[PDB]
Design a protein around this ligand. Structure first.
Ligand SMILES: CC(C)=CCC/C(C)=C\CC/C(C)=C/CSP(=O)(O)OP(=O)(O)O
Ligand SMILES: CC(C)=CCC/C(C)=C\CC/C(C)=C/CSP(=O)(O)OP(=O)(O)O
Ligand SMILES: C=C(C)CCOP(=O)(O)OP(=O)(O)O
Ligand SMILES: C=C(C)CCOP(=O)(O)OP(=O)(O)O
Ligand SMILES: [Mg+2]
Ligand SMILES: [Mg+2]
Lengths: 327, 202, 327, 202
């Protein structure tokens, strides 16, 4: 009935947790909670019962994560594609969501005592107006909490998120807050729904599917990918433990690759900027280098002016995003 | 005539599967040694022989993009030996084979965002005119289909910046190494993709 | 009668030498042996006697330098401008030079026992043909010795040296061994008469004049400048010691300035090359950067091809310079 | 009318010396603090007041070349106060004052060598046509006279890359600091240059 189970780890779980916590631990784990309906059929129960147990496992898995010191979790809860299912199933899912978000506001203050921040990411205008208001309440209430973070991807796809982010930047140049040349990989990051969290360390999908189904495609480009056969309502602490173990075995090569990518992107951005400065300096008829350090000044100004327009764009984008949440 | 029999056998193999990829991705994550170009070329030639239209070769260090001629030469060499007029063979491999590196992913989405924001600044487009499909058309993929199967070679459990936008439904099959890869191993991955069930959210 | 005096240092000279040798010592000292005629007038002797004592002090000062471990010395012995003096004085100088270079070949082998290399730099075609042959003999004989180095600037000016160096590089492009864009500060260094020695650490001029009189202008741009009032025939070990002391007090700021200059020149050369690569890449219609690292390859090739033409030019320039010395 | 008396006094000072520099160089070697622009401007204004035609301001870190407007503004400010129509005053200081850095030395000789070698490559000149005078004409000095006096300020006993080619006969007078420099100190250096004997090798 609540959104986080209150239970400590058993001996073997505690013991193994202490062991792996001697190595690199994930700061952020993302889940694709897949396999509910197959689980319902395997246990000879209705599909709403499968989905209902699926939510219970989400509350259980968050307690495992908090006990493991993993304080940020993102979950795929409802895809835009899931709107294509039968009205009976979609209404069943909408009703389950109405019920848990309503119990969430009743279980408030218990959200203060643990500092849990609830973020709900997606094209939320596709949801029923009432469910939107329940979502907005929960989001507005748990803002300014910082002890842990749960991002619920509801009525979400990654392509819709990436498209909206580009629309945001296009709004920036339309308003005069951005030049088209300011658009960058780093700037698109900050226009995603997930812009207040770091990219996931691990992406876990259950049920044995080896696809991503339009989930955090931008964000998991360098995440550890763990595809586990177990059905989501049957997820155990040890499935989660196995996934973290996978991440620890991948960590050294994943971190080097993450850093080589970042270093290469900054190197190429510098080459492009120097070439821009050189093109302008080839025009005007000025020297490409010299003791006056003209190109060094124009490089600093080109960058500083870019960071200034970007910071102004982001402040306006955050004011617009708080406005819709306030109403 | 011996090569004609092999051509038939390979085409019969691809036609026998419940489904075949139209666009195959090869992601090489092994960084111990430099990749085996003859092994990569063999995977590519098998893809063409069994009927896969497009093949994208990817590594996150850009080694294949910086050794494009070596790779094509090896592909053309083995394709000729299997298919027993070099220009048409060269043009065919250039139309089917694309060598990719990280910049083809996120950096290309950024390039498209710049192109669209430039149209907004010219009063030729509105920010609201950029839906999921228009952005898809703006990418460097153009008309080519998204990869439906990716063979990931190596010990890294990651896609490492491979067509983020295009792999929303791509099946990701993992093999331990591309070195001395066998056709049986390659075809077993095709059988796995053939057996997968795609529900599209329904 | 010889070209180097055979004498050890006295106690106080030895003691002070050991002291300063605990700090940075000059590897190369250049002398402007100025004041001979004023010394002749002060001692009421003929000017040839002043010049003759001037040579004796040169032989004495070289022994001081060898005892101090300063193994390379450059001296201004005769300026092209000195040809404008009276025939009586010029003939007197030419005769003194004929006599010492002739005694030098008689005192050969004693040049082997100390590995002394004699180089005579200047526009030597202005000297009498006989004196040229004596100079060429001494130079050809002491080649391949490496224990110490004396560079005698005879019929020399710096502007004539810099002009000849530029003519050499122009010869390179005429022959096809050089592109005009290969010309650089470093390349001009290697076309000077002094190209087989490092730039002087100290420039000493005697007699109280505070000018350079067209001597090692390129080479002493970052040398320690020591102008000492004493007349050259009266130079003592302690004048030399005072000059080294000046160099040690200047060394930290002189070395930082030398290095900041070198670092800045290489930085600006890299900017120019990157801009060249960018201009070519703007033409042809190729990208200014990308994962193919096209500009990184073109930068390496632009540099490697430059170093290859330069090395070929220098080998030809050294073959031509050995040919004239052989004849 | 008070400023007219000062103008007369300064001109009478310059005319009283046995000789006066046509082109004065100011080499600042002090690197402890940033140079005092008002002190530098005062040296420059005194040079103009006593009758020196050209003044070159030099520091090996390029500080003056990167602060050209600050220096001119300070020069124009003090020149107006001493000389009691801003464009003509600005043009006059630009014709008399040149701010230099190391690139004006060796790097400019290299630029001239490139220009000449480019003519050789175009069959427009022969390597033998480059004598001492033609190279002098190729430099960025053009028609301006070489410095005959350099005032070197600071504790460094070096020219630190100041017009190597142009200082073949320049007298190098050294002062301990440009900070709070007095006119008497500046004029004593002029007296020293006035007293020097130039024999030109004879
Ligand atoms: C956030 C909240 C309060 C509720 C949402 C979270 C819950 C309980 C369920 C998610 C809904 C779906 C479709 C999960 C995918 S499993 P599936 O339906 O695809 O089953 P299958 O893969 O076909 O076996
Ligand atoms: C290398 C060799 C064997 C001989 C040459 C070295 C000797 C002995 C003399 C150098 C000749 C001159 C002109 C020295 C300058 S002093 P000055 O003539 O300018 O006298 P001044 O400055 O007028 O007092
Ligand atoms: C809420 C979730 C987990 C949506 C993704 O699972 P799907 O079941 O909808 O994706 P497909 O297997 O149909 O591709
Ligand atoms: C051989 C030498 C030392 C020539 C330089 O001294 P000079 O006496 O000829 O130079 P000026 O003082 O005449 O300028
Ligand atoms: Mg599913
Ligand atoms: Mg003299």
């Amino acid at each position: 009935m609540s959104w986080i189970k209150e239970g400590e780890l058993s001996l073997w779980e505690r013991f193994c947790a202490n062991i792996i916590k001697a190595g690199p631990m994930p700061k952020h784990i993302a889940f694709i909670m897949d396999g509910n309906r197959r689980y319902a059929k395997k246990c000879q129960v209705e599909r709403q019962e499968g989905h209902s147990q699926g939510f219970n496992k989400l509350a259980e898995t968050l307690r495992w994560c908090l006990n493991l010191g993993i304080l940020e979790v993102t979950v795929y809860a409802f895809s835009i594609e899931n709107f294509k299912r039968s009205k009976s199933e979609v209404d069943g899912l909408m009703d389950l969501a109405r019920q848990k978000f309503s119990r969430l506001m009743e279980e408030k203050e218990k959200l203060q005592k643990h500092g849990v921040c609830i973020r709900v990411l997606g094209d939320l205008h596709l949801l029923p107006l009432d469910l939107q208001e329940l979502i907005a309440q929960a989001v507005q209430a748990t803002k300014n909490y910082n002890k842990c973070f749960l991002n619920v991807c509801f009525a979400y796809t990654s392509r819709h998120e990436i498209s909206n982010a580009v629309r945001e930047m296009a709004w920036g140049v339309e308003q005069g807050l951005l030049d088209p040349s300011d658009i960058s990989e780093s700037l698109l990051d900050k226009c995603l729904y997930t812009n207040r969290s770091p990219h996931p360390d691990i992406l876990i999908r259950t049920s044995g599917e080896v696809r991503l189904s339009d989930f955090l495609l931008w964000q998991t480009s360098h995440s550890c990918l763990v595809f586990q056969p177990v059905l989501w309502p049957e997820y155990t602490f040890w499935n989660l433990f196995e996934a973290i173990l996978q991440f620890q075995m991948n960590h050294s090569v994943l971190q080097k690759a993450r850093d080589m990518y970042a270093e290469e992107r900054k190197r190429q951005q510098l080459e492009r900027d120097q070439a821009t400065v050189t093109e302008q300096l080839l025009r005007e008829g000025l020297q490409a280098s010299g003791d006056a350090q003209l190109r060094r000044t124009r490089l600093h100004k080109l960058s500083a002016r870019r960071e200034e327009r970007v910071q102004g764009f982001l402040q306006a984008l955050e004011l617009k995003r708080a406005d819709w949440l306030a109403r | 005539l011996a090569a004609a029999h092999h051509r038939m056998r390979w085409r019969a193999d691809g036609r026998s599967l419940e489904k075949l990829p139209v666009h195959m991705g090869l992601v090489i994550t092994e960084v111990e040694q430099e990749p085996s170009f003859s092994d990569i070329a063999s995977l590519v030639v098998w893809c063409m022989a069994v009927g896969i239209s497009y093949i994208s070769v990817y590594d996150h260090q850009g080694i294949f993009k910086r050794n494009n001629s070596r790779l094509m030469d090896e592909i053309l060499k083995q394709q000729q030996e299997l298919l027993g007029d070099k220009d048409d063979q060269v043009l065919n491999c250039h139309l089917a084979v694309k060598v990719l590196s990280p910049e083809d992913g996120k950096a290309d989405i950024v390039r498209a965002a710049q192109d669209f924001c430039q149209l907004v600044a010219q009063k030729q487009k509105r920010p609201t005119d950029l839906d999921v499909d228009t952005l898809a058309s703006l990418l460097s993929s153009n008309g080519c289909p998204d990869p439906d199967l990716v063979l990931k070679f190596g010990p890294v459990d990651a896609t490492l910046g491979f067509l983020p936008w295009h792999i929303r439904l791509t099946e990701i099959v993992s093999l331990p190494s591309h070195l001395n890869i066998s056709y049986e191993d390659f075809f077993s991955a095709l059988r796995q993709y053939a057996a997968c069930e795609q529900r599209l959210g329904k």
